[PDB]
Amino acid sequence: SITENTSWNKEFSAEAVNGVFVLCKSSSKSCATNDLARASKEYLPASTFKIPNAIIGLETGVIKNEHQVFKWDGKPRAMKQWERDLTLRGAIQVSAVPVFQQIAREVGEVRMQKYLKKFSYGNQNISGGIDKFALEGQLRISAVNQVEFLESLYLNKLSASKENQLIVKEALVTEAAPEYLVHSKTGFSGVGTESNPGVAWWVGWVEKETEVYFFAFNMDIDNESKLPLRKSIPTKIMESEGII
Amino acid sequence: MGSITENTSWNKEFSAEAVNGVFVLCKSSSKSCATNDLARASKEYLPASTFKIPNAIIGLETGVIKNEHQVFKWDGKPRAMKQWERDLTLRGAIQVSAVPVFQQIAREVGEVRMQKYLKKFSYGNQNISGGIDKFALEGQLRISAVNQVEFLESLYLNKLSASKENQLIVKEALVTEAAPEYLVHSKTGFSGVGTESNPGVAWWVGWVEKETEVYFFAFNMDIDNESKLPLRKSIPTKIMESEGIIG
C-alpha cells in the first residue's frame, strides 16, 4: 500500500525539482509519497548499488572481511578523494566507483545475477558490462523497491549471512544523534541532457526512539549545482514529520 | 597494545580546567599508546556505565538479550531519571545510560555467567562483589584506562570471546558521531560525585576510525561536582582535535 501525501509537494515546487520521496514507518507495508506514479518508476541506481554490491562482495568472499582495506595502486582515479587506501565504509562513503567496479568484476556476471534475483533488486538487469551496469547500463530500481530492499537489510532478511548484513549496515551509518541514527547512501548517475536528465538518489532509514523509518528519494538532475537537494528535500520532509 | 609513552604536553588541557585525569590514546596500526600520566593510566576505577559495553555483549551472548531489535519496555514505575521513563532500544538504553535496564540484564545473566565472561574478556579486576546489579557502579569492580583500550581493541577486531554478530551489534549501538572522514564509537561513565577528599570518577572511552587508521581511547578524571561532567568529553575531544584525528 502506497498513499499520496500532497503536503510534501511544496519542497519540490520551491526548488523546481521533479522527484519523489517514499517514506515508510515501521515497515514497507504502508508507505507514503508525494507522487504515486514516480514512487514505482525505475531509475539507474548509480552508487546506491554499492549497498547490494558490498553484501555480494562479502557473501562471495571477494571482500574477505569487515576490516578489508582496498589499497590504491597509485594509478589515476576519476575523483581525487578516491586516490587513497579505503576501508569498506570509506569506499562506500566517498562512493569509490573503481573499488566497486573491481569487486563486481571478481563477483562475475553469474553470481551478480543470482544475488540480484535473491535480493529482488529492481529489474535485475545487469547488462551493459559487469563494471558499469548500475551507472550506464540497464539496471533500474524504483524508490519503492529501494525501501523494500533496505527493510530486508535492516531486518537481516536478505539472502546473506546476518554477519555480512551487520558489516554493511555499520558502513552505512551517516548521522548519529542522541535522538536518532541514520543509515543512508547517495547516488548520482550524471547530468544527462535537458531532454534526458540524469538521476540523483538518497536512500536509507532512520531509527528514532523505538521506531524505524525507511526512505528513498530520487530526482531528475541536469545540473550538478542542484545535487545537495537530494538531501535537503527529504531531510526537510523528515524534519517536519518530526523524524530528524 | 605494543607500547606506551608519556606525553606530558597534553596536561595543558587538564590544567586549563583544573582537572586530575588521564587520557590514553592508541594507534592501531603501530600498536602504540600515548598518555599524559603513565601512573594514572594503570590505576583502576569503577567503570560505572562504561560497563554497559561488556554487559551488552554478555546479555546478547547468553541469549538474555534476544537480538539488536529488542525493545526494553518501561513497566511504568518511577525511575531515577525522566529520560529512562520510556521504552528503549539497545542503543537507546546504552545512549541514555539506563541503569535499571542493564541491572535487569545482569540479574538474568547471573553471577556465574557474568564471572565467566569477565574472565574471558580480561575485564578489570574481574571482581563482581557488591550485588549482581551494582558491582560496576558501587561494588568492587575496577578497570584501568589501559585495560579499557585493550578491551575496546579486542571488540573492534571481533576478538572477544563472543560471536562476531554480537560484537557487531554492540559496536553499531556504540556509534556516537559519524563524519564522512571519521566514525566515533563511544561510551560515558559516572560513578557519582563521591566526596571532597574521595571524589567520584567520570569516563569517556571508545575508538575513532579515521581513513584506514583506528584510534582507541580511554579517558577518566576525578569528579566532585556534576557541573564538571562535560569535561569528560571536551578534554579528550580537544586532544584528539590537536592530534588531527577528529574535527
d(CA B200, CA B187): 17
End-to-end CA distance of chain B: 25
Query: Which three cell numbers, joined as nine digits, stand for B62?
Result: 547468553
Nearest to B178 among A66, A167, A176 (CB): A176
Nearest CA in chain B to A174: B178
**Which DSSP letter does residue A46 get?**
G
Method for structure elucidation: X-ray
Q: Quote the cell numbers at residue B154.
A: 579486542
Distance CA A156, CA A152 (A): 6
Residue in the block written with cell 551507472: A135
CB distance B175–A178 less than 8 Å?
no
CB A98 within 8 A of CB A85: no
**φ, ψ for residue B118, nearest 5 deg:** -70, -30
Which residue in A238, A234, A200, A203 sits closest to A219, CA to CA? A200
Q: Find the CB nearest A175 among B164, B168, B178.
A: B178
Q: Which residues contact A73 (CB under 8 A, 6 or more apart)?
A: none
SS3 helix, strand, coil % of chain B, rounded to 5?
A: 40, 25, 35
CB B172 within 8 A of CB A173: yes
| Residues in chain B, total | 247
From the CB of residue B119, how many other CB atoms can be counted at a distance below 10 Å?
A: 11
Q: Quick check: B45 and B231 in contact, CB under 8 A? A: no
Look at residues A172, A65, A235 and name the one whose alpha carbon lies nearest to residue B178: A172
**Whole-number Å distance between alpha carbons of B100 and A121:** 43
Whole-angstrom CA distances from B19 to B100, B108, B202 are: 30, 38, 11
Which three-class secondary structure state does DSSP give residue A81?
A: helix
Q: Which residues in chain A are closer than 8 Å to B89, comparing Cβ atoms?
A: 207, 209-210
Rounded CA separation B171/B233 (Å): 19
Round to whole Å and give the CA distance between A66 and A55: 11
Contact present, B63 and B38 (Cβ < 8 Å): no
Contact A178, A207 (CB under 8 A): no
Residues whose CB is less than 8 angstroms from the CB of residue B234 and which lie 6 or more positions away in sequence, other chains included: none
Q: How many CA atoms lie within 13 A of A42 on its CB side?
A: 11
Is B202 in a helix, a strand, or coil?
strand
As assigned by CATH, the class of the B1-247 domain is alpha beta
Min Cα separation B40/chain A (Å): 30
The grid coordinates of residue B171 equal 559496536
Largest CA distance in chain A: 50
Task: Look at residue A172 and give its three-state secondary structure.
Answer: coil
The CA–CA distances, whole Å, from B190 to B48, B83, B99, B134, B161 equal 6, 16, 11, 13, 27
Chain B residues whose beta carbon lies within 8 Å of the beta carbon of residue A209? 86-87, 89, 92
Residue A34 DSSP one-character state: S
Query: Is A68:A61 a contact under the CB 8 Å cutoff?
Result: no
Q: What's the rounded Cα separation, in Å, for the pair B56 and B59?
A: 5
d(CA A42, CA B199): 62
Residue type present at position B71: V
B169: left (phi over 0), alpha (psi -120 to 50) or beta: alpha
Amino acid at B94: I
Instruction: Give chain B's radius of gyration (CA, Å).
Output: 17
Number of neighbours of residue A117 by Cβ within 10 angstroms = 11
Whether the CB-CB separation of B56 and B94 falls below 8 Å is answered with yes
CB spacing of B92 vs A209 below 8 angstroms: yes
A66 interfaces chain B, CB cutoff of 8 Å: yes
B130: closest CA of chain A, how far (Å): 31
- Are A211 and A243 in contact, with CB atoms under 8 Å apart? no
As given in the structure block, the three cell numbers for residue B227 are 557541573
Nearest CA in chain A to B71: A210
Give strand pairing partners of A203: A185, A216
For residue B193, the distance in angstroms to the closest alpha carbon of chain A comes to 24
Maximum pairwise Cα distance, chain B: 50
CATH of A1-244, one of 3.90.550.50, 3.40.710.10, 3.40.50.720, 1.10.3720.10: 3.40.710.10
Q: What residues of B are designated binding site for a beta-lactam?
A: 97, 188, 190, 232
Residues 87-116 of A with CB under 8 A from B: 87, 89-90, 93-94
B172 vs chain A: nearest CA distance in angstroms? 6
What is the rounded CA–CA span in Å between residue B241 and residue A133?
41
Catalytic residue numbers of A?
47
Bridge-based pairing of strands B71-72 and B3-6 is unpaired
Geometric angle at alpha carbon B228, from B8 and A176, rounded to 5°:
90
**Given CB atoms, is B165 within the 8 Å cutoff of chain A?**
yes
Contact B180 A94 (CB under 8 A): yes
